[model samples]
Target: GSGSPLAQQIKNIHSFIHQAKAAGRMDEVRTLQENLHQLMHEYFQQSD
Candidate 1:
């Protein structure tokens, strides 16, 4: 069983996304999604 920081971050970003969306802040929500996705890509070394 592996517990990586990336896994925990994914959970946190998911929660933030929900709150942001609930507040009707679509712009910030998009930015958070982009940032979180970028972090994931960088952490995992993806070229997409």
Candidate 2:
């Protein structure tokens, strides 16, 4: 299935995390990962 808006956001955040990790930005990566989880819950709940 095609992804919804939330999925797209998660994907973008994943990319950001990858880049941040490569650049030694551990803090940024951590924050992005946290936000991704939060977004996933919030997004999935709306469809319920």
Candidate 3:
């Protein structure tokens, strides 16, 4: 099924972590955490 913007967000986060771990840059790991926090924060702000 064609999903929503949120589906893409989750996918982007997943791919980012996968590549970051594979490359072992270790810096990008923080990006994933930030992205997740942003998503969750926005979700609560909008939904609740």
- Please name the candidate that would achieve the greatest lDDT relative to the true structure: 2
**Candidate 1: RMSD to truth:** 3.1
The alpha-carbon root-mean-square deviation between model 3 and the true structure, to one decimal in Å, is: 3.1
CA shift of 43, model 2, Å: 3.4
Residue 2, candidate 3: C-alpha displacement in angstroms: 7.4
Question: lDDT by residue for model 2 over 6-48, one digit each (tens)?
Answer: 8888889989999999999999989999998898897778653
**Candidate 2 vs candidate 3, TM-score winner:** 2
In model 1, the worst 10-residue window by lDDT is: 39-48
What C-alpha lDDT does candidate 2 achieve relative to the native structure? 0.88
Model 1 segments beyond 4 Å from truth?
1-3, 43-48
Cα lDDT of model 1 by residue, 1-48, tens digit: 587878788788889999999999999899989979977886788466
Q: How high is each candidate's TM-score?
A: 0.70, 0.74, 0.63
Q: How many residue pairs clash in each candidate?
A: 0, 0, 0
Q: Model 2 Cα displacement at 10 (Å)?
A: 0.7
How many pairs in model 1 have backbone atoms within 3 A of each other, for residues 3 or more apart or on separate chains, i.e. clashes? 0
Best by TM-score: 2
State the lDDT of candidate 3 residue by residue for 1-48, as single tens digits: 566677578778878888998899678878787887787676556653
